[PDB]
Design a protein around this ligand. Sequence first.
Ligand SMILES: O=C(NCc1ccc(CN2CCCC2)cc1)N1CCN(C(=O)c2cccs2)CC1
Length: 143
Amino acid sequence: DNQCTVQVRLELGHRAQLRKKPTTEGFTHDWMVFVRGPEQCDIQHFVEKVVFWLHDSFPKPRRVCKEPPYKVEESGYAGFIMPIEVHFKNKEEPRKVCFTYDLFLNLEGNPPVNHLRCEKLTFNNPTTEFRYKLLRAGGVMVM
Ligand SMILES: O=C(NCc1ccc(CN2CCCC2)cc1)N1CCN(C(=O)c2cccs2)CC1
């Protein structure tokens, strides 16, 4: 008599623009990648940390945000595939979800890049504890 499914939403995104002039290092672009909730949700209730796995070419390429904003700001010269791990305040499975984020840059004279990726997470029969956190964050029951 106690089955329940709770949906929460995540937004992954990034912005990238051509620097007026390259940096010293010949970095041509500024970019920013993030994880956030939709308007008026606090994903920090169920998200323990977000880990952004930058290209090997970056120093300390494992970037952790343990609280909002969940984001990395950098300059560089090339797009790459970025693993993003979102770790949950969950005692049981699933403990985290792993995205493969396409961090692409604007070439030539293309406008700046401003992309959003909307992810719907479905938790089947979460524990009492974690269920609270999902709801506190503005998660929704699906019966
Ligand atoms: O833009 C960068 N690298 C991105 C990259 C490099 C090479 C490749 C290989 N791609 C294969 C197809 C074309 C390029 C992917 C991504 N970085 C890495 C180098 N870099 C830096 O060394 C630093 C920044 C701040 C402190 S040190 C920052 C800029």
